[PDB]
Design a protein around this nucleic acid. Structure first.
Length: 51
RNA sequence: CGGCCGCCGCCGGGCGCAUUUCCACCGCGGCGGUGCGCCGCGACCGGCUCCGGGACGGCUGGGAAGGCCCGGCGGGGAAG
C-alpha cells in the first residue's frame, strides 16, 4: 500500500525478503509538460452519438 | 563539538528472469501532445435568418355571414 506500492511476494529466492514494485517512477521527465488530460466533459465520442 | 535521527556517496556481503537494469519486437493497452498535403462525417453549445404544426384571451362578452325557418305589418327596384 505505502511502503511497497501493491504486493510483495516473489523474487529473492535466497538472501533476504521478497518485495516487488508496480507503477514505478518515471525514468525520464520532459523539459516542459502540458496540463490537464483533456476530458469527457459532455462531448460524447462517436460511439454514442444519436443515429 | 559529544550525542539524536534522517539523507547521500563509496566499500564489503548474501544474491537470480516474479528481485534489477539495459535492449529489440508485439500487445498498437492506460495517458499526453500531433498528422506530410488534400478532404469528408456525427453529436452537444452560442449567435442569427427562416419553415411547418398546433392550443388561447379580449371586442359591441366580437361585426358580418352559413343552416332549418315559421304566423304578421309595410316599403322599394322591376315578375314567363
Amino acid at each position: 500500500v505505502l511502503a511497497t506500492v501493491t504486493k510483495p511476494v516473489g523474487g529473492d529466492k535466497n538472501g533476504g525478503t521478497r518485495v516487488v514494485k508496480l507503477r514505478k517512477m518515471p525514468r525520464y521527465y520532459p523539459t516542459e509538460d502540458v496540463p490537464r488530460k483533456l476530458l469527457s466533459h459532455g462531448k460524447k465520442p462517436f460511439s454514442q452519438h444519436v443515429r
